[PDB]
């Protein structure tokens, strides 16, 4: 009769991969209604807002996620990406470096994604 938070997150994940970003973000919003203390729902929605060029909305969701999970690699990484697109280069680099440190501490492996993002951000700061 009613979807669980997990059903809604799964539906949002499918819409995200399907390039339906506003629809995915709304699904994560419905998951948040059901369980508002889960940081992943906010970081997932932040990534949707990034793909929608809605940087202020993405930044707010990263901040919410960080209140719920201060160790979140993705909250720091997406926050850094947000700030990079808003030309806040020093803050972007700090958050990407923090994502690097947290990923190493948590033994996560994203390939060279985080160092590559750092190089991109430093080059953009210099080129601007």
């Amino acid at each position: 009769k009613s979807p669980s938070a997990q059903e809604l997150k799964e539906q949002g994940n499918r819409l995200f991969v399907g390039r339906k970003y506003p629809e995915a973000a709304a699904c994560y919003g419905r998951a948040i209604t059901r369980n508002p203390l889960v940081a992943v729902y906010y970081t997932n929605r932040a990534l949707c807002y990034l793909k929608m060029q809605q940087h202020e909305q993405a930044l707010a969701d990263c901040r919410r996620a960080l209140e719920l999970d201060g160790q979140s690699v993705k909250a720091h990484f997406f926050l850094g990406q947000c700030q990079l697109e808003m030309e806040s280069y020093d803050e972007a680099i700090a958050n990407l470096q923090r994502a690097y440190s947290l990923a190493k501490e948590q033994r996560l492996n994203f390939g060279d994604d985080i160092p590559s993002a750092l190089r991109i951000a430093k080059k953009k700061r210099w080129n601007s």
């Binding site: 994940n13 970081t43 997932n44 990534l47 994502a99 994203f110 994604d113």
Partner: peptide, 6 residues
């Protein structure tokens, strides 16, 4: 990739 939902 890190550029993905969880």
């Amino acid at each position: 990739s890190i550029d993905m939902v969880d």
